[PDB]
């Protein structure tokens, strides 16, 4: 995932658990580090609004735009416990980013997280790193009550309707760098949590 | 609101909810839902 202005390095939500304070359990929910997809097969599932992602595409770049669909390790028991995400990009120039992620219902924006964040120079590139992101409130709610539910079959069914999109701005010229649009199921796998990525178009 | 999303799935009867295309009905690539 990224252009020649921006790259994702990694990207990872997951949930860590103090036993005692020298131990600590933690679990990967989704992480990161095929055929195309019809960005308007999707614009009911994201907020359309003023500066919602039909206005955003036309915006352009349309090499910078993404939708990852998410199969979700949801495997973990659930005190000490810490919500969190993780994310890393990297330049080949220095920048002033701004990272907008909107937890979505039904198409419907429930709450966006804004951070703003630096370069600092490594390795003859430019890296910006979020580093242990508090989950907001909403979202820990959220993936509870996913985990009431019986059957890993529901969880599919109503993550359906429940979308993350996630859009990297260069704060001075407004440009986006990176879109995400992100879809969801739980894994079925022995493997864990996995990723598909695909670019939007059209 | 968010049990509504989670009733539905549970009890079908009672099902108060926007209906809405399936993802598998939609024009989407065959390796879109191939995990
Ligand atoms: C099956 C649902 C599991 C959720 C997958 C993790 C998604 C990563 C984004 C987490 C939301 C962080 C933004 C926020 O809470 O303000």
Redesign the interface.
């Known amino acids: 995932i990224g252009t020649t202005k921006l790259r994702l390095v990694e990207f990872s939500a997951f949930l860590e658990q103090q036993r005692d304070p020298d131990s600590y359990n933690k679990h990967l929910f989704v992480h990161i580090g095929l055929e195309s997809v019809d960005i308007r097969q999707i614009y009911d599932k994201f907020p359309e609004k003023k500066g919602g992602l039909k206005e955003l595409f036309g915006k352009g770049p349309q090499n910078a735009f993404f939708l990852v669909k998410f199969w979700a390790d949801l495997n973990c028991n659930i005190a000490g416990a810490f919500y969190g995400v993780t994310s890393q990009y990297e330049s080949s120039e220095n920048m002033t980013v701004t990272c907008s992620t909107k937890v979505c219902s039904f198409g419907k924006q429930v709450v966006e997280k804004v951070e703003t964040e630096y370069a600092r120079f490594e390795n003859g590139r430019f890296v910006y790193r979020i580093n242990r992101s508090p989950m907001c409130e909403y979202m820990i709610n959220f993936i509870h009550k996913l985990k009431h539910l019986p059957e890993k079959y529901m969880m599919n069914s109503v993550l359906e309707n429940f979308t993350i999109l996630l859009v990297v701005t260069n704060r001075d010229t407004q440009e986006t760098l990176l879109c995400m649009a992100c879809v969801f199921e739980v894994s079925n796998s022995e493997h864990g949590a996995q990723h598909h990525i695909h670019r939007l178009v059209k | 609101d968010?049990?509504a999303?989670?009733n539905?799935?549970?009890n079908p009867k009672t099902a108060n909810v926007?209906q809405?295309?399936?993802?598998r009905l939609?024009?989407?690539?065959?390796?879109?839902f191939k995990?």
């Open positions: 968010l049990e999303l989670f539905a799935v549970m926007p809405t295309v399936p993802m939609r024009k989407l690539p065959d390796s879109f995990p």
